[PDB]
Amino acid sequence: EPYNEWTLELLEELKSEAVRHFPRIWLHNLGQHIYETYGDTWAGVEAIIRILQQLLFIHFRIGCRHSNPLEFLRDQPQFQNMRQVIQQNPALLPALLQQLGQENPQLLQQISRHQEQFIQMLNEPPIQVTPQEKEAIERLKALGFPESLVIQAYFACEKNENLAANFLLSQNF
Numbered sequence: 001e002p003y004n005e006w007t008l009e010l011l012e013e014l015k016s017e018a019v020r021h022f023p024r025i026w027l028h029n030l031g032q033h034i035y036e037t038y039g040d041t042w043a044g045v046e047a048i049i050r051i052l053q054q055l056l057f058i059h060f061r062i063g064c065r066h067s068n069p070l071e072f073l074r075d076q077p078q079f080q081n082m083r084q085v086i087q088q089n090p091a092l093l094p095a096l097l098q099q100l101g102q103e104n105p106q107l108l109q110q111i112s113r114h115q116e117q118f119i120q121m122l123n124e125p126p127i128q129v130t131p132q133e134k135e136a137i138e139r140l141k142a143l144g145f146p147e148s149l150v151i152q153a154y155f156a157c158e159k160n161e162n163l164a165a166n167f168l169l170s171q172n173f
């Protein structure tokens with residue numbers, strides 16, 4: 001049961017990278033909403049770890065305004081390539097991250113569960129919705145954001161249409 005004490009040992013590191021690439025405001029809400037959803041229960045802080053990672057991935061595509069089943073990634077061109085472009089212009093991610101999941105679906109599933117470890121290298125030397133929730137997702141799109149960028153955020157903010165709003169406007173830029 002590491003999620004108890006351990007989660008604090010790893011999390012602290014997960015925030016160091018996220019909190020640094022994440023908007024203070026959002027980080028203030030995510031913990032506020034996610035705190036009111038589950039409450040004080042440990043499940044809340046537990047979902048914050050997973051929601052934090054999946055969020056980092058987006059921070060890449062959107063554009064970083066700042067500055068192991070994945071370790072083998074180095075054996076892939078997309079890494080050395082996407083990393084050569086992404087680091088130069090994360091704006092080329094949306095199109096890349098797509099070609100990555102279309103070619104290597106096994107890795108795409110990992111890179112998502114290993115953002116930090118996936119970023120450090122990328123920053124250093126080498127659905128489930130319905131007609132009731134949907135209307136809530138696209139609601140953020142009209143804000144001037146891709147249709148997919150919403151499906152992710154919405155689910156990234158715990159389906160919190162109130163949170164995503166800030167997550168979209170606080171996603172850099």
Ligand SMILES: [Zn+2]
Pocket residue numbers: 020021022059063064065066
């Ligand atoms: Zn950043």
